Symmetry: C4
Subunit: 287 residues, 4 copies
């Protein structure tokens, strides 16, 4: 009955805190876009600090640079690794040429890699799928059915898309303490070969259903939450995409009916009106 | 009976109009090939307009450029970010060198990214699958079976390919108004481990079938359309591909039989003749 | 009984001849490695022929090049699009600089794309799966079972790998002429979460089997062939791979038993001996 | 009863030794990170050794290089293929210019490819999934159930993840010698639409189970091992990942119960405590 703390947030993210360079690839792609341009911008500097430090490690090898001045070796270093090569700051002798070839080799390895991640980070698209703000439990074809709906926000379609409704709630074990059980709920249409507009997902509540007989109260008490797992291959990106959302007992409108989002234009051509997406019809009795 | 407006077009595209920078990645890959070369061509210009604007923000730092002339700073700017570095327009002092390194850093970030999308846009292949112009309903192994066929237009094969026949038609709810129902039709062979030539898809019409007993009329009236969803992994691209098509009541040849597309060459070696692909045998009674 | 022409070759390729720039992406990746280096090597030349043709379209704009000589404009053109920029052949005036920026823009678009395909073509790996030279039909757990085996030639493993045995043979329709039927044969283990060594695929021949009761003769006569479709995700490439093979009636050793390929090393550690891979035990009666 | 040699190691790797340039792509991605930077660093050198050898193959074509000195042609060669182009070492005549364009063409093909692999090798991520050190067999909902658990070590989640428990043990054929049988064990939850924290996998031991009635002894004797095959699409990388592990008879704690890894923080917010991950509760009788 009483209000409780959310285990999952509306965006299907968790409120559990785990407890714990050693995971660079993940780290690299994982970091905020500024921190990345920072790391890279950094590495770049350090290598030219190293090479500048190399051409000085040997005598005054480059021409037109002042002796022992690291500055000159460093700006040369950028000009040799970025393949600009103006022609003022220039090498001298066999040794300087060898180092330059090496820095050019790296500068080329530098980009090839800076570009790999630059792209990996890039090729992680959203589905632009919209989830309904509530869900309803309402009789459908004479059976109390729990339902929620989602819509594709993009012109381009999503193919072989599918979704999961997963109840989560505390339940006493046959023996021992209480644990939240992961109940994957059976749907009338789990898969959808194509999805461009709107989809009402629904789980009929029959004798086998975890929420069979469950009321608001018993639900509240079981501390039950629901989680939508949507996934599918976006036609637009030619690639996979996903999306999560979470609902709570407060959200479920009982006897709710989603409202038809399909509208006729003045022109008379039909259309989809995402304004009704969250509208839920409800019947009100007297007093 | 009467003619009606198409909900889907032959190319399986929709005639619904939704209603609604905020979606850059999608936008970027989404845009027409000219608009892209335009955006990029543009950004390029703006940055060199910015850098040219930087070397001028400080005194006359570059050598061989006229003072205060933005022009010189800008063409220098392209030569410094594209790593040409002729050696006429050249930096001076510590500050100019630092900016040059920064522009070189960007010019390298610029390409790495311009190349990501250049490739993403590129790696979205067609299946080169051809759909039959009509479909038929014809008895097959003593059961009225709805069928349509598709063929692979490329030498290279498509693997683990599969298709969906999805009837779409207006149907009165158990209560409330009319809605088009998404009937996914059961096929005799949904999957095909490999597909290189021709495939007749078919949905037997038995007691469970949505179109069981349905006639042209009742079909027309139910405003029914059919949609082919083909997908599969092209051997050629080593990658996934798909294709849609739509059919209408007018298209279905009742009692139609697709005509064998397999032909013997003069040499005697057998072959596939895509000329008969759309040919449908029909029996004509008297008068 | 009599020998016949193969519809599929040992490498699971077809002997049907279809009948039929318009398909560039496919074409590009499709072509032989020389033809590719050729197309590219070509395009490169044509553009610099175009740009060289541009700097000449206007007066003598570049310095150190002879007037009206296309040669000079062309080698300059490579040096401006490849971002070498020695500093002999150099622009003059606002117009030359503008074209140079444009060629640099293209030269950078040129690589980004030349690299996309350079990579796409590259990232199409073989599975290095080996197929047995014959197949056998032999009693297994008291049931005549058709079987064939394949092995992974690479240290690295293949995961969620699966295979299809697909009989192909001419069969008279319930009405009309003869057509080859695609019989996908039911296996005892279609999927395999992991595969690194050897796998005997097998299709038990029971009452439901297409080849139930079929003999060599009836098989020969039905002109039956079998096709192995293997697919799976190679751990090595972190990517998908596949492989086909075809067998004929001549190949099937009846009463054949594949011979155990697992061998103990002198060291005593166990090992896999791909020498027995194609060895088939057969029992020989008298006379 | 007696101790035996492990067929699989804890990391799910094999102890079988197979028996056997011809497989470059695999080889390339396969090799240790040093050996790679080596091969490349090498190829680079050889080509410039070739080009340097070309400009010398013809007369003294480049300006500012000493005649017949390969050294000069080689360092020039790096400066022409890396597109630095200082402007000291410079071409002369039509022939030198043509070769330079060719080397620039290659130097650009060189990077495009060096970058393909540089990235392919890069985009092969770990799942950072942790496996429990033992497994248990313990009654669960009144049925002896074999179980093991794994946890996601990364903030980011893994989606549509699934696992396989695969018993492996020597078993006498209906006829002939002994072979290890690949028993894929049926689980209560094979698939999991999402996985971020902890997952107890479990195989109920009923009449159909390979290990039905099996004891430590009979297991030991059957030389049975178990192999966990985990796979799933990491949300972090936007890509697929996998992980193997192996267990032995010694590892299985009979009557074991994994210990709840979920802990409440001082703040009161809940959390996951990977310290209990390997903790197994066991009941101890008297004496
Ligand atoms: C809603 N659906 C999943 C059953 C049908 C497909 O969605 P849509 O065709 O309206 O875009
Ligand atoms: C038509 N099919 C899907 C059943 C068989 C495979 O197609 P194909 O082998 O003719 O290219
Ligand atoms: C043969 N198999 C497919 C059943 C088992 C897995 O193959 P392997 O473990 O011997 O490499
Ligand atoms: C354990 N599970 C697989 C059933 C549920 C999902 O895992 P998780 O939600 O705890 O990260
Ligand atoms: Ba350059
Ligand atoms: K220069
Ligand atoms: K110069
Ligand atoms: K230069």
């Amino acid at each position: 009955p009483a209000r409780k703390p959310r285990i999952l947030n509306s965006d299907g993210s968790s409120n559990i805190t785990r407890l714990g360079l050693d995971d660079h690839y993940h780290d690299l792609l994982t970091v905020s876009w500024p921190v990345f341009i920072t790391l890279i911008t950094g590495l770049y500097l350090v290598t030219n600090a190293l090479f500048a430090l190399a051409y000085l490690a040997c005598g005054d090898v480059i021409e037109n640079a002042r002796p022992g001045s690291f500055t000159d070796a460093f700006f040369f270093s950028v000009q040799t690794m970025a393949t600009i090569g103006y022609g003022k700051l220039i090498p001298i002798g066999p040794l300087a040429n060898t180092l330059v070839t090496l820095e050019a080799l790296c500068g080329m390895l530098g980009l090839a890699v800076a570009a790999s991640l630059i792209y990996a980070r890039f090729t992680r698209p959203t589905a632009g799928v919209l989830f309904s703000s509530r869900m309803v439990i309402s009789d459908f074809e004479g059976k109390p059915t729990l339902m929620m709906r989602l819509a594709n926000l993009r012109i381009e379609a999503i193919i072989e898309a599918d979704v999961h409704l997963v109840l989560v709630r505390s339940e006493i074990s046959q023996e021992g303490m209480v644990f939240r059980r992961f109940h994957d709920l059976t749907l009338t249409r789990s898969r959808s070969p194509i999805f461009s507009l709107s989809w009402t997902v629904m789980h009929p509540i029959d004798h086998h259903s975890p929420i069979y007989g469950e009321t608001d109260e018993t639900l509240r008490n079981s501390h039950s939450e629901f989680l939508v797992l949507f996934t599918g291959h976006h036609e637009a990106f030619a690639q996979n995409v996903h999306a999560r959302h979470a609902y709570s007992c407060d959200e479920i409108i009982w006897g709710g009916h989603f409202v038809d989002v399909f509208t006729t234009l003045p022109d008379g051509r039909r259309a989809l009106d995402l304004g009704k997406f969250h509208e839920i019809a409800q019947h009100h009795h007297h007093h």
